[PDB]
């Protein structure tokens, strides 16, 4: 994924890797994602019929009222001066992913009617640590009453690899009774 | 008049100039580049604007040679189209689009 | 994250400044056409008027701009 | 049945947003309830010719798109273009979409 945005987030992740502030910068971009979940500030920054000076003033004001480093603020200033402000949501959504990449914490997603314990989470996490090479393995659960028998796990670069133990048995034997 | 534009992109005969956010020249105005030749003397490459590109940037048209212009030069607006001398003065002189007598004779009214 | 009340007020004030219900603004005018910002309520073919009244009609009703 | 919004119209072609999960299949009719020149409501249909993605579908309008502003409420039918068929069709001139234009009466 060499997108229009992934080079920016990989550059910021590289800067945080050399400078050594990665786990802080992830909280920084979480604050910025919570900022850019809203419509008015995102519309303020995205639209092209607002002059640059008041944009400078209000970004400096958000930095002063939220207390951030120029390590982060320079990226947003570069984004606005390069007119990539429309894709800040994309850059920040992929930056946690490239953090997981260069810091080896693979997100594991499972979906079922699940009411699990620490045993299920821990064992499948250590198994996918062995088979995918996670430095640390981290978990996520999705609770959905659709799948009856087992589960459905997703993982990979974009959750691309899938081995579901709920309905593959179902669909397999439904296709195999006629075959 | 009394402003300063920055050459931003030169693809041959076409020119991208940026202006201060308020003051923007109208279409079919006449810029004038305060450029220089290979000898460094201040030489002009007059320039006609055709289109507001947006994001306080415009696209223009160069009326003379482009070989010798750099990204970071300066340009001044006249606020009017390319004025040309008229009347009994312009009778018997070679003329260019820049209103310059091209034949080896003196200046004009 | 903290959105302060002065920041929120300046943002909403500027957004009301740029986004007036009946109008919009000009983005680029290249050789006899116009890409107008906003005008999210207007109709294709419905005439518009600019500053100094030079009349124009709208056709290329896109998502960011309108032609 | 999902109620959609207009993103763009460009002449007769359209750009119709939709709910994040639900979307019409290609060649589903699109009912866009609009207005006339004096504002009385009128209906202009469209047909999904393409699914560009990101909850946007390309729609070619069977009626002229004068009456349809941006952001207008678009309704999906889910099924393809329905036309009445049977003994009612014999002896009547139709439009593109079954609504007859002999003006003896409406369809049955």
Curated annotation (Swiss-Prot), chain A:
One of its GO terms (molecular function) is proton-transporting ATP synthase activity, rotational mechanism. GO terms for cellular component: chloroplast thylakoid membrane; proton-transporting ATP synthase complex. The keyword Metal-binding does not apply. The keyword Cell wall biogenesis/degradation does not apply. Keywords: ATP synthesis, CF(1), Chloroplast, Hydrogen ion transport, Ion transport, Membrane, Plastid, Thylakoid, Transit peptide, Transport. It is found in: Plastid, Chloroplast thylakoid membrane. One of its GO terms (biological process) is photosynthetic electron transport in photosystem I. It comes from the Eukaryota. F-type ATPases have 2 components, CF(1) - the catalytic core - and CF(0) - the membrane proton channel. CF(1) has five subunits: alpha(3), beta(3), gamma(1), delta(1), epsilon(1). CF(0) has three main subunits: a, b and c. This protein seems to be part of the stalk that links CF(0) to CF(1). It either transmits conformational changes from CF(0) into CF(1) or is implicated in proton conduction. Belongs to the ATPase delta chain family. This is ATP synthase delta chain, chloroplastic. It comes from Spinacia oleracea. The lineage of its organism: Eukaryota, Viridiplantae, Streptophyta, Embryophyta, Tracheophyta. The gene is ATPD.
Swiss-Prot record, chain C:
It comes from the Eukaryota. It comes from Spinacia oleracea (Spinach). Belongs to the ATPase alpha/beta chains family. F-type ATPases have 2 components, CF(1) - the catalytic core - and CF(0) - the membrane proton channel. CF(1) has five subunits: alpha(3), beta(3), gamma(1), delta(1), epsilon(1). CF(0) has four main subunits: a, b, b' and c. Produces ATP from ADP in the presence of a proton gradient across the membrane. The alpha chain is a regulatory subunit. This is ATP synthase subunit alpha, chloroplastic. The chain holds residues 7 to 73 of 507 of the full protein. It is found in: Plastid, Chloroplast thylakoid membrane.
UniProtKB/Swiss-Prot annotation, chain D:
The chain holds residues 18 to 125 of 498 of the full protein. It comes from the Eukaryota. It is found in: Plastid, Chloroplast thylakoid membrane. Transmembrane segments: none annotated. Belongs to the ATPase alpha/beta chains family. The lineage of its organism: Eukaryota, Viridiplantae, Streptophyta, Embryophyta, Tracheophyta. The gene is atpB. This is ATP synthase subunit beta, chloroplastic. F-type ATPases have 2 components, CF(1) - the catalytic core - and CF(0) - the membrane proton channel. CF(1) has five subunits: alpha(3), beta(3), gamma(1), delta(1), epsilon(1). CF(0) has four main subunits: a(1), b(1), b'(1) and c(9-12). Produces ATP from ADP in the presence of a proton gradient across the membrane. The catalytic sites are hosted primarily by the beta subunits. Coiled coil: none annotated.
